[PDB]
Amino acid sequence: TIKEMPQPKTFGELKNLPLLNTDKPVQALMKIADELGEIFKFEAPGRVTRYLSSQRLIKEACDESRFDKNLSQALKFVRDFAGDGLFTSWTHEKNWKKAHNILLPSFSQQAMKGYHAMMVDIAVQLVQKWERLNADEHIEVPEDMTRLTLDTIGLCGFNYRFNSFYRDQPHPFITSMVRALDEAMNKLQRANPDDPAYDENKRQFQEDIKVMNDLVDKIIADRKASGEQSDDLLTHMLNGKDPETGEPLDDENIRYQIITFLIAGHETTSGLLSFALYFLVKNPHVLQKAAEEAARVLVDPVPSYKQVKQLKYVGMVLNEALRLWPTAPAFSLYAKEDTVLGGEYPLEKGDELMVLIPQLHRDKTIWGDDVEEFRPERFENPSAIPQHAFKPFGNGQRACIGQQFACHEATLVLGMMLKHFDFEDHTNYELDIKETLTLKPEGFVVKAKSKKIPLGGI
Amino acid sequence: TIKEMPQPKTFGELKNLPLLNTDKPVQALMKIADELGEIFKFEAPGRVTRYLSSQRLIKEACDESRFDKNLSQALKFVRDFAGDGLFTSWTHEKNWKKAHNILLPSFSQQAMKGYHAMMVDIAVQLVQKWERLNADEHIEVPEDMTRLTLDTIGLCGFNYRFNSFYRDQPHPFITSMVRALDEAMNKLQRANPDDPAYDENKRQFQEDIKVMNDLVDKIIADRKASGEQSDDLLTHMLNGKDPETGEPLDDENIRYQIITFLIAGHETTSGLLSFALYFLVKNPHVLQKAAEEAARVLVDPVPSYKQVKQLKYVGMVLNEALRLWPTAPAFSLYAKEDTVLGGEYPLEKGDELMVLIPQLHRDKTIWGDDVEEFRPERFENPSAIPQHAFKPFGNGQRACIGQQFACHEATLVLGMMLKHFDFEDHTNYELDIKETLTLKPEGFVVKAKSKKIPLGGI
Ligand code: HEM
C-alpha cells in the first residue's frame, strides 16, 4: 500500500538545500539515512530527489527497463569540462553509445594483460620512493596513492608521464583539474549562484578549462602528427570505429574522454588504495593474511599478470574497502515512465533517485548486524552476495568502464606494498574523510619498514 | 630444494592399500601423519595421493588458482545416489555452478532467520524428550543428536517430518541412505567388484537408491502440483533461477540436492553436537562457563534468532569441538597445472592431494603446544587464526554450503540443553570414535537432570 516518504529538516524557502552546505555532504546524507531509513525525499528550490539506501529498493532502481542514468546537478557542473565523455553523457546521446562501443574492448579483463607492464612501471616508482625514505620519515598515503593512480592512467592510457613522483606540487594540468572539480562541487551549495562575490571563481573556472583543453588537445594533435602506433587508449580512440554507426570519435569527444579518464584515475582508485591501507593498519590480523598471501604469491622480482590474478585475499580486502567506503559514493537515476517503487512509492516519468552506495553497503538485512566491521571474508565465496547488494562500480550499461583497470591496478600495487614493507599506524590516525568528487582519508599517514626484498627492473 | 616424500609401510604389490582395511581409517592416517610429518605419499594399485597435515602446505593446497576439488573414490561411489548434487559434482559441471549460485543466498547467515522457527520446533522436541525421562534413565547422545539434526534438515529443507523422536528404528529412507553409504564405503576395499559374490550387494544398493529416489521425487512432484510456498529450500529450488545462465535446476538435480542435504544433516552435523557435549562433560569448568552464558542470554521461554547470535561462548565450544574432531575430516584436491608444493615437492597436472583436517588442527606451529586440550578460549577472536589453519568446512568456492545452518542449529540446541539440564558423565565414558562417512563418539551416554525451567510453545 502507498506510503508518504520521510524528509529531513527544512530551512524555510530553501527547503533541504542547506543540508548540503557542508564540506562532507555524502557523510551528512548517510546520517540522515540512518535516521530516516531506506528512502527519503530531498527538496531544493526547483528540484526534488529521492535518496535510496536499501537493497530492496535499490534492486528495483537498477532495473534498466524502468530507470536510466541521470546527471545530478554535480555531474551537470562537471560536464562543463568533461563534456559528453562517457561519465557525463546521457545514455540517449549518440556519443555515449559510440564511445562505449569503441572503448569497451580496451577496458576488458583481456586488455589488462597489455596494460600490466606500464602499471608495474609506476608501482616500482612507488615502492622505490618508500624504500628510499629515512628512518624518521613517514608516508602521506592519499598523496602517494594519487601520484600512483594518476601516473598510471596517464602512461597506460596516453603514453604521457605526469612524473608525479618527481614533484611536490602537482602537474599544472592537475592543478587546474582539481580546482575545476572544486568549483563544480562548491556550486552545489550556493543559495545565490549569480551573487557578484562569485565573479572571480567564474573567471578562474574558465582559465582552468582552458589549461585542460590546451594540454589534452596538444596530446591528441601531437599523436596525430607523429603517426606513432603506441597501442594505448589514445591510439584506439584515433583509429577505432564504432561497429554500430561505423563512425569514429571526433577529436573534441576524444579530449573529453581523456579528461574523464584523468579525473577517474586521480579521484577514485587512489581513494580505494588509501582506504584499503587504512583498514589494513587498523586490523592487523587482516594485514597479516594479506601480507602472507603477497609473500606466497609474488615470488618473482616483479609481479606478472598471472600472479596478480592469484591474489584472492588482496581482492577480498579491496572489495571490503569498497563496501565500507565506495569512493564514488552516489549515482543518480530517473524514471523512464510512471512507475511504483517497492509497491509503496509512486513515481512520475522523469522523477530522480539517488543511490547512496555506502548505505546500501550497510544494509543489515543483507550483510548482518556487524556492518561497520572490516571483514574481507565476506567475499570469500562471492556467489553468496545477493544480486544488486554490492554496487561500488554503479549499474548496468552505465557501470564503471574502468572497473577491471582499477581492480587490476589496486591489486598489483597493494600486493607489492604488502610484499615489500611492514606498516605502522604511528599516529593512531583518526579517520577523517574529505569529499571532492570522491572520498579519501585526509591526513592518513603511516611508517613503512622495508622487508629488504630486492625489486626487479621494469 | 626438491625432497622425496615419506611413505608408510607397504604390502608388496598392494602398496599402502591394506592400511585402510580397518574400522578406523582416518584415525590410522592421523597416526601415520604423527610418525611421518606434514606430507606423505599413499599408493594403491593404480593410484597415488599425498596426505597433507601442516598449515604451511595446506595454505598452498587451498589456492584455488592451483588446485580444485577432487572427487575421491569414496565420493565417486556416493555419486551413484547423490548424483550431480553440490557435494559430488566437479566444479566444471554446469549443474555445480548453477546449483551453487541458486542455493548460496538461501544458506546465508541471514537466511537462518527464516529457518529459526522450524529449528526451534525440533529443538523443543529434543528438550521435551529429556524432560520426560525417568530418574533411572540415561541419554544415548549421538542417537538423539541425529534425531535432531536429520529432522531439522527435513523440516527446514522441504517441510518433511521424519518424526525421528517418535521412532526407535530409522525412517525407511534413512535405513536405505545409511546402507547405501555403507555399501559406498565398503566398495573401497573390493579387489574385483564384478565378482558374483557381490551380486546381492548390487541388488541391495539398487533397492536402496530406489527407496531414496521414490520418496524425494514424490516430495518434489507433490510440491509442484500444489503451488504451495513454504520459503523452504525446496521452494527456492523450484522457483530460483541461476543469475549466470538464467536457468533453473531441473527436477532430477533438485532430488540430488535434497538427498545430499539429508546425508549432510544426518551424522555429519550430529557429530558436532555429540563431540561438543563429550568435551563439555569431560571439562566441567568449560561446561559451567557455557551454562552460565546460556542462562544469562536465553531469558525467554524459547530462544530468538538474536539470542542465539549472542551465544558467543557456546559458538567457541562448537569451534573447539570442530578443531579436535572435525566430522568431515578429509577432502581431496587435484593440481590444475604442474606446480611445486612448498618449494620441495613437484606435482604434475592432475596429481591428487588429501587434506587431513584433524592433523591440520593439531599443527603446533599454529595452535601452540597444548593442541590436545579442549580450550574454547582459542576462539575468542576467530580473526586471529591464520588463513587455511581452521578448515572444518572445507575451502573456498567448494566450502560447505551448510556451515551457517549447522552452526546456527548446533548453537541453538546446545544453548537450550545447557539452559535446561545439568549433565553427568555417569559411566566415565571412554571415547571410541566410529568411522563411516563421518566421525561419531560411539556409545556416548550421559544423564541429564532437569533444572525444571519452563519451556515455551513452538
Ligand atoms: C575504485 C575505482 C573506481 C570506482 C569506485 C569507480 C566508480 C564508478 C561509478 C560508481 C560509476 C557510475 C557513475 C554513475 O552512474 O553516475 C563509474 C563510471 C565510470 N567510471 Fe569509474 N570508478 C573507478 C575507477 C575508474 C577508472 C580507473 C576509470 C578510467 C580509467 C573510470 C572511468 C569511468 C567512466 C568512463 C565511467 C562512465 C561509464 C559510462 O557511463 O559509460 N573509473 N565509475
Ligand code: HEM
Ligand atoms: C558440522 C557439520 C558439517 C561439516 C563439518 C561439514 C563439512 C563439509 C566439508 C568439509 C565440505 C567440503 C567437502 C569437500 O571438499 O569434498 C562440505 C561440503 C558441503 N556441505 Fe557440509 N558440513 C556440515 C554440514 C552440512 C549441512 C548441514 C549441509 C546441508 C544441509 C551441508 C551441505 C554441504 C554441501 C552441499 C557441500 C558441497 C558444497 C559445494 O561443493 O558446493 N553440510 N561440508
